[PDB]
Symmetry: D2
Subunit: 319 residues, 4 copies
């Protein structure tokens, strides 16, 4: 190619900027131009397009959020919109698009490709729920946000001999809960991919009160339920005073961790390589510590999973 | 005195350990023993008393929470209680007591003195309302916790052109909301100590939407209302997508910042000096960058106030 | 006034952009325009100047460094240089100037006022080495940078039963060393403002070793000497495994802490107020937890001093 | 096996405690006793061995360093030192040893296995320089200490238009440097696994300055040389203003990142599993995102490599 475009869609995620930065610096290394599309697919329909310069990506690698913004777009679900997007792309002479994000911001990469516009997906979310890759951009940072919260709430929990339900993000995926709860010494972790028995949680807790334990932390993925209801169930059942904490959107922001920066630079650069060598309708990622690329069509079919041996581990480490 | 005691009551607070460390290591310098009372006044009543050694304050200057724990004590409000508690004191040959915390807890230090046990209070809470001091131990730390949070939500707010309501702590004091909302560039701060008008707030938001500001962030002290409510009021009015975040108890934990560690080391040492100088029924504090001790009785009558000129400042800097 | 300017001079400092943000939003409140001068005094001479919009003050409140940059200017230390400064000032209709920084930024604020140009100065340095104020914009953030490091070095020193020496910045002031070491539970602090005896230090570490203490952190202010040297004198003297860390300019950077963001916001806002009230040749600051302003020339006249009791406290707590 | 021991040798590393917690809690899950061996190998020889109880691990997951300490041991390469090692082991009824540490530690773990005593080795070092694993416990944390430093030096370098050289740790491995440099946005990265030409460095540095760039970060792995020199060199080569930061041992400390806590917890638990299945002489690890174990002698045979394509990418991204 000679010119390509880049875009972010779906939720904000720490590292997208590093991802974006990479798309650009790489294309430059190959004599290619990059045009930033703003406000995601909404921005694409709208014509929100402006060339990015070597200097528009200088000093953003550390920066959370996405400089190109992001927004939902019902219109892009229709042939109608898909059509107008390509016009606007064609208008600026853009022959290739790197789509960075999650929430089937891939559907669009696919749709686009099917209309014969070359398109590559980069995994962008905090909740690890994108196929084609073991980890997504933003997950590592989001975890350190969660366990930093876990570290703090343990300070009070220990001081006051109290039990906390912390509700983490992960709308469908229990990744955050699994990983963070493992890392915070969480003595109960409740995920969507694994059965739980509330009567079991209650007993375990009672059991520790005896064996000298007065504080306790219960990580709960939002995809399982509302922390508020869970806490209710526990205090009502144990008489222990039981606080509840919903971390919510703090999880979505922050300076991306070293893992998230490297991953974003690698992936985003891979995505460019694919466009340039003619490929399209693909999504890159990291699998088994290796760079991979896949057909979006194929990847969107792979049901998401969590490492069950780890969930097991955490139960063992926390009887 | 040759032997004294130390205890922490009311809510947890980052820096208390630094206070306790300082209470202990200062006493040692003067050849005085120090005994820890565990689990607040409940502990005192109970007899939870163990000498502290040099090696028990060997960390702990960086650690949040309180190694002496803390717990409520209905029983200590009744006379029979403090009595029982003084017995315990006498039983271990303790001649004085440093009471670190809110909230409070100065009440007990007072009644203790009245019963002829020499008692010194130290300002420990995150919300900042303990009289006899411009700032309480834990404040600076909590503020940096809230701004870390404000920073992260600004990251997502900006990418999505969304408006956030963030509910912070301070059940009766607007200190946190004021100081952090200033440090966080929050365009709206609501505190118990100053009139607010929601029509003004709403208009202000609609105004900026035009001006070109697509994201805004409202800071709200819990002592004013429920964030998950103000948010509803705003969006059920303006057409704006409004998200809400209650940070809750993450605010209570954490490694105390430099200001808090230094403040704790100072107040702690001062508190021990009072006891040794034979004085009692006092409480220490920082006032106009100078340390002061006041009669608890008087201190307890001074309504808590916030710097109205700063609140004002935050308004001017905001429109 | 209808138009002022702002610049940043001397070593950059966390929370300057907070100070800048404040200078600019505050002026906009009173219907006043702000022109930014880039690259400190060198930029003023060269007329590197651009209207700041609302726009460019962010949010940048969390950002370290200075969006206006900074650079040394030997030339401005001379009559003709200032002539160019004013020429440029007037060429843009800038009626007043807010100067943010340290290490002689104030010098220019005075000279400029002397030549009949209203200037307010704002304390901006990590080392806290600026009169007319208890704390300078950048100090709190620096201290927290230093203790994070001390905490980390405490982790490794503890595991290995080793003794470290950490050299912190400060220039001529020992504020950082005294405040951080005290916050970090250091067992030795060495500063310009207090006197020490190496033999004291030595024996004091040899003694702590007697009571079974297996690790120590000595904190040394650069203004007192090289951390490397102290490490050496000590290891030769005792035989203990002694390492030395020079944190360096790490202390200069980072997102400014809540205190630094607030101080900058207050100070900056107060600085513009002064110009608007026709006041000039003043520097803002915070003293005894109250906002104050002083005539520069006389503020610059006080030798800086540390809190002697606190140093004494830090010893008793060892 | 009813009783095993655990120890930490080599340089200390954030997450060792997490690794200990896991060794000690996993064993309890299986009704095995754990005996701590303090001060690494010098301790093993001298006895200095104490039962680890639940309480001894119930609050260390978040803590840097090693609660078991670590010390060098010249004695333990001799035959007699080892003779002494085993006696002491047999004296406490320790049927097996988990060695958590760095490289030299693996040596002794083999010698023990040879002399009829089952050992498992756990990768513990910040410099990633240990075979039988892609990453070592400590790496992630160290990287993040490095990038935060880099971030902070970016602030001052950008306001002053300075060029910086930052010396990072890694005796013979360029992993920290390469990885943090990529993460940080280094314009220049120097490491032992890959040839560099100083002149191409100066040239690459001059081309960038002529292309407008006013500030630049340069990362040097301590194994390549001394930061102060590369500083002198390029200062007098370019004339630019140039500063030198040596981070030194800060990299060694700090609360372990989510990744290091998780890795530590999986690896440590796996190490217990091995000894319990009668599989001595091994070292655990993560390779291609999968848990693995390898004969110690064999792993110790593999010269350590970095990812050349990654070093390549870092170059392309900074043109
Ligand atoms: Ca950011
Ligand atoms: Ca902080
Ligand atoms: Ca910054
Ligand atoms: Ca730690
Ligand atoms: Ca796996």
């Amino acid at each position: 190619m000679k010119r390509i475009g880049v875009l972010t869609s779906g939720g904000d995620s720490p590292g997208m900027n590093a991802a974006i930065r990479s798309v650009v610096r790489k294309a430059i290394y190959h004599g290619v131009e990059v045009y930033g599309v703003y406000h995601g697919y909404a921005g694409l329909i709208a014509g929100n397009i402006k060339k990015l310069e070597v200097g528009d990506v200088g000093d953003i690698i550390h920066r959370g959020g996405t400089i190109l913004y992001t927004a939902r777009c019902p219109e892009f679900k229709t042939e109608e919109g898909q059509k107008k997007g390509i016009e606007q792309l064609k208008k600026h002479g853009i022959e290739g698009l790197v789509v960075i994000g999650g929430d089937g911001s891939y559907q669009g990469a696919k749709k686009l490709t099917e209309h014969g516009f070359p398109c590559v997906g980069v995994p962008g979310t905090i909740d690890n729920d994108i196929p084609g890759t073991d980890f997504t951009i933003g997950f590592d940072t989001a975890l350190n946000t969660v366990i930093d919260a876990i570290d703090k709430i343990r300070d009070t929990a220990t001081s006051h001999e109290r039990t906390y339900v912390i509700e983490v993000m992960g709308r469908h995926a229990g990744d955050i809960a699994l990983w963070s709860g493992l890392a915070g010494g969480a003595e109960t972790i409740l995920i969507p991919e694994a059965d739980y028995d509330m009567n079991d949680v209650i007993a375990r807790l009672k059991r520790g009160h005896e064996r000298g334990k007065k504080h306790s932390i219960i990580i709960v993925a939002e995809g399982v339920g509302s922390g508020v209801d869970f806490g209710r169930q526990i205090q009502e059942a144990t008489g222990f005073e039981t606080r509840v904490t919903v971390l919510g959107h703090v999880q979505r922001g922050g300076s991306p961790t070293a893992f998230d920066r490297v991953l974003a630079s690698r992936l985003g650069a891979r995505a460019v390589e694919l466009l340039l060598e003619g490929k399209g309708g693909r999504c890159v990622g990291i699998q088994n510590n290796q760079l991979v690329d896949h057909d979006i069509a194929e990847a969107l079919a792979n049901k998401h999973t969590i490492d069950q041996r780890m969930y097991a581990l955490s139960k063992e480490l926390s009887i």
